[PDB]
Amino acid sequence: HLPVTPRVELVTMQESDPKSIITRICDLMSDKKVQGVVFGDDTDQEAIAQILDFI
Amino acid sequence: DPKIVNIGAVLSTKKHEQIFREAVNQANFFHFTRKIQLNATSVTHRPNAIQMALSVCEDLISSQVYAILVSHPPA
Amino acid sequence: SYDEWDYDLPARVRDGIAIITTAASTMLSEHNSIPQSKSSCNNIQESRVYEAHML
């Protein structure tokens, strides 16, 4: 019922890196023009949030 | 045996990169080269933050830098 | 800590998607305007993305 319907592209990556994450998220950006991102991890790592925040 | 210990930097211009490498070589010459050697790597400032961070992870850290130097860009 | 048992990770992701699309729906209701924006990081941020603050 919500006025906008979601179009979703899902991708997974195995282990976290500043380079891997930055590259991939920008890569998904492409011309694609995504207006939102949700991130999730199996990891215990503190740092990750800040990185995505930087993006 | 020598061991090459990399250093890395981001600087305003290629001339300053040459200055960097020169200073590094002065450091190598004047301290024991038998035990250890220092190697220099550097890159010009990139237009966004992201190209540069990618540069650090790719262009610099792939060289195993023990430290990085940074300078304010021309503009 | 947050509990895994109460709600599993996909339920949580559903919450995230729901938040993004609900924000999109409310922003729509207010300005009748598409939130969609050019995603590419490498170039300058797309115009009218500066407008995004209200989101």
UniProtKB/Swiss-Prot annotation, chain A:
Coiled coil: none annotated. It is found in: Cell membrane; Postsynaptic cell membrane. It comes from the Eukaryota. Detected in oocytes. Heterotetramer. Forms heterotetrameric channels composed of two GluN1/zeta subunits (GRIN1), and two identical GluN2/epsilon subunits (GRIN2A, GRIN2B, GRIN2C or GRIN2D) or GluN3 subunits (GRIN3A or GRIN3B) (in vitro). In vivo, the subunit composition may depend on the expression levels of the different subunits. Component of N-methyl-D-aspartate (NMDA) receptors (NMDARs) that function as heterotetrameric, ligand-gated cation channels with high calcium permeability and voltage-dependent block by Mg(2+). Channel activation requires binding of the neurotransmitter L-glutamate to the GluN2 subunit, glycine binding to the GluN1 subunit, plus membrane depolarization to eliminate channel inhibition by Mg(2+). NMDARs mediate simultaneously the potasium efflux and the influx of calcium and sodium. Belongs to the glutamate-gated ion channel (TC 1.A.10.1) family. NR2B/GRIN2B subfamily. A hydrophobic region that gives rise to the prediction of a transmembrane span does not cross the membrane, but is part of a discontinuously helical region that dips into the membrane and is probably part of the pore and of the selectivity filter. This is Glutamate receptor ionotropic, NMDA 2B. The gene is grin2b.
Curated annotation (Swiss-Prot), chain B:
The gene is grin1. It is found in: Cell membrane; Postsynaptic cell membrane; Postsynaptic density membrane; Synaptic cell membrane. A hydrophobic region that gives rise to the prediction of a transmembrane span does not cross the membrane, but is part of a discontinuously helical region that dips into the membrane and is probably part of the pore and of the selectivity filter. The extracellular N-terminal domain (NTD) is a site of allosteric regulation to modulate overall receptor function. Component of N-methyl-D-aspartate (NMDA) receptors (NMDARs) that function as heterotetrameric, ligand-gated cation channels with high calcium permeability and voltage-dependent block by Mg(2+). NMDARs participate in synaptic plasticity. Channel activation requires binding of the neurotransmitter L-glutamate to the GluN2 subunit, glycine binding to the GluN1 subunit, plus membrane depolarization to eliminate channel inhibition by Mg(2+). NMDARs mediate simultaneously the potasium efflux and the influx of calcium and sodium. This is Glutamate receptor ionotropic, NMDA 1. Glycans are attached at residue 39. Belongs to the glutamate-gated ion channel (TC 1.A.10.1) family. NR1/GRIN1 subfamily. The chain holds residues 23 to 97 of 903 of the full protein. Heterotetramer; the NMDAR subunits are modular and harbor tiered domains that function in concert to regulate opening and closing of the cation-selective ion channel pore. Forms heterotetrameric channels composed of two GluN1/zeta subunits (GRIN1), and two identical GluN2/epsilon subunits (GRIN2A, GRIN2B, GRIN2C or GRIN2D) or GluN3 subunits (GRIN3A or GRIN3B) (in vitro). Does not form functional channels by itself.
